[PDB]
Motif scaffolding. Structure first.
Motif, PDB file in Angstrom:
ATOM      1  N   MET A   1       0.860  -1.223   0.000  1.00  0.00           N
ATOM      2  CA  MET A   1       0.000   0.000   0.000  1.00  0.00           C
ATOM      3  C   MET A   1       0.882   1.255   0.000  1.00  0.00           C
ATOM      4  O   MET A   1       1.921   1.293   0.637  1.00  0.00           O
ATOM      5  N   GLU A   2       0.472   2.279  -0.710  1.00  0.00           N
ATOM      6  CA  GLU A   2       1.275   3.542  -0.762  1.00  0.00           C
ATOM      7  C   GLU A   2       0.757   4.531   0.293  1.00  0.00           C
ATOM      8  O   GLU A   2      -0.368   4.434   0.753  1.00  0.00           O
ATOM      9  N   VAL A   3       1.574   5.486   0.672  1.00  0.00           N
ATOM     10  CA  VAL A   3       1.145   6.497   1.694  1.00  0.00           C
ATOM     11  C   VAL A   3       0.080   7.427   1.094  1.00  0.00           C
ATOM     12  O   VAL A   3       0.068   7.689  -0.097  1.00  0.00           O
ATOM     13  N   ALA A   4      -0.813   7.928   1.915  1.00  0.00           N
ATOM     14  CA  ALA A   4      -1.880   8.843   1.407  1.00  0.00           C
ATOM     15  C   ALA A   4      -1.316  10.265   1.279  1.00  0.00           C
ATOM     16  O   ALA A   4      -1.232  11.002   2.248  1.00  0.00           O
ATOM     17  N   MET A   5      -0.925  10.650   0.089  1.00  0.00           N
ATOM     18  CA  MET A   5      -0.360  12.018  -0.122  1.00  0.00           C
ATOM     19  C   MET A   5      -1.208  12.765  -1.159  1.00  0.00           C
ATOM     20  O   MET A   5      -1.130  12.501  -2.347  1.00  0.00           O
ATOM     21  N   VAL A   6      -2.022  13.694  -0.715  1.00  0.00           N
ATOM     22  CA  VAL A   6      -2.885  14.467  -1.666  1.00  0.00           C
ATOM     23  C   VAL A   6      -2.298  15.868  -1.885  1.00  0.00           C
ATOM     24  O   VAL A   6      -1.850  16.520  -0.957  1.00  0.00           O
ATOM     25  N   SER A   7      -2.300  16.333  -3.112  1.00  0.00           N
ATOM     26  CA  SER A   7      -1.748  17.692  -3.417  1.00  0.00           C
ATOM     27  C   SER A   7      -2.348  18.212  -4.732  1.00  0.00           C
ATOM     28  O   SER A   7      -2.538  17.465  -5.677  1.00  0.00           O
ATOM     29  N   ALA A   8      -2.650  19.488  -4.796  1.00  0.00           N
ATOM     30  CA  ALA A   8      -3.239  20.069  -6.042  1.00  0.00           C
ATOM     31  C   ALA A   8      -2.837  21.548  -6.162  1.00  0.00           C
ATOM     32  O   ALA A   8      -3.665  22.442  -6.095  1.00  0.00           O
ATOM     33  N   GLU A   9      -1.562  21.809  -6.337  1.00  0.00           N
ATOM     34  CA  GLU A   9      -1.085  23.222  -6.463  1.00  0.00           C
ATOM     35  C   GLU A   9      -1.248  23.692  -7.919  1.00  0.00           C
ATOM     36  O   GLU A   9      -0.285  23.843  -8.651  1.00  0.00           O
ATOM     37  N   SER A  10      -2.471  23.919  -8.341  1.00  0.00           N
ATOM     38  CA  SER A  10      -2.723  24.378  -9.745  1.00  0.00           C
ATOM     39  C   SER A  10      -4.189  24.812  -9.891  1.00  0.00           C
ATOM     40  O   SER A  10      -5.083  23.992 -10.008  1.00  0.00           O
ATOM     41  N   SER A  11      -4.437  26.100  -9.879  1.00  0.00           N
ATOM     42  CA  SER A  11      -5.842  26.605 -10.012  1.00  0.00           C
ATOM     43  C   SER A  11      -5.864  27.900 -10.845  1.00  0.00           C
ATOM     44  O   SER A  11      -6.755  28.721 -10.707  1.00  0.00           O
ATOM     45  N   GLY A  12      -4.894  28.085 -11.711  1.00  0.00           N
ATOM     46  CA  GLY A  12      -4.855  29.320 -12.555  1.00  0.00           C
ATOM     47  C   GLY A  12      -3.727  29.207 -13.584  1.00  0.00           C
ATOM     48  O   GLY A  12      -3.967  28.947 -14.749  1.00  0.00           O
ATOM     49  N   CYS A  13      -2.501  29.402 -13.160  1.00  0.00           N
ATOM     50  CA  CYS A  13      -1.346  29.310 -14.104  1.00  0.00           C
ATOM     51  C   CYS A  13      -0.163  28.593 -13.427  1.00  0.00           C
ATOM     52  O   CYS A  13       0.988  28.916 -13.662  1.00  0.00           O
ATOM     53  N   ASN A  14      -0.442  27.616 -12.595  1.00  0.00           N
ATOM     54  CA  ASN A  14       0.659  26.867 -11.904  1.00  0.00           C
ATOM     55  C   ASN A  14       1.144  25.712 -12.792  1.00  0.00           C
ATOM     56  O   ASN A  14       2.288  25.303 -12.717  1.00  0.00           O
TER      57      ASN A  14
END
Length: 37
Positions: A1-14
């Motif tokens: 099983m992999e570690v739970a790592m959530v990320s979403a640095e992108s909401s315009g021009c990232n």
């Protein structure tokens, strides 16, 4: 099983990087760990 790592640095021009570039770093980096050829 992999570690739970959530990320979403992108909401315009990232994610301005060209499509395919965000898949070449991990695709080339995975060869260092999964080096089977």
């Amino acid at each position: 099983m992999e570690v739970a790592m959530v990320s979403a640095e992108s909401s315009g021009c990232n994610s301005h990087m060209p499509y395919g570039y965000a898949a070449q770093a991990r695709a080339r980096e995975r060869e260092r760990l999964a080096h089977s050829r």
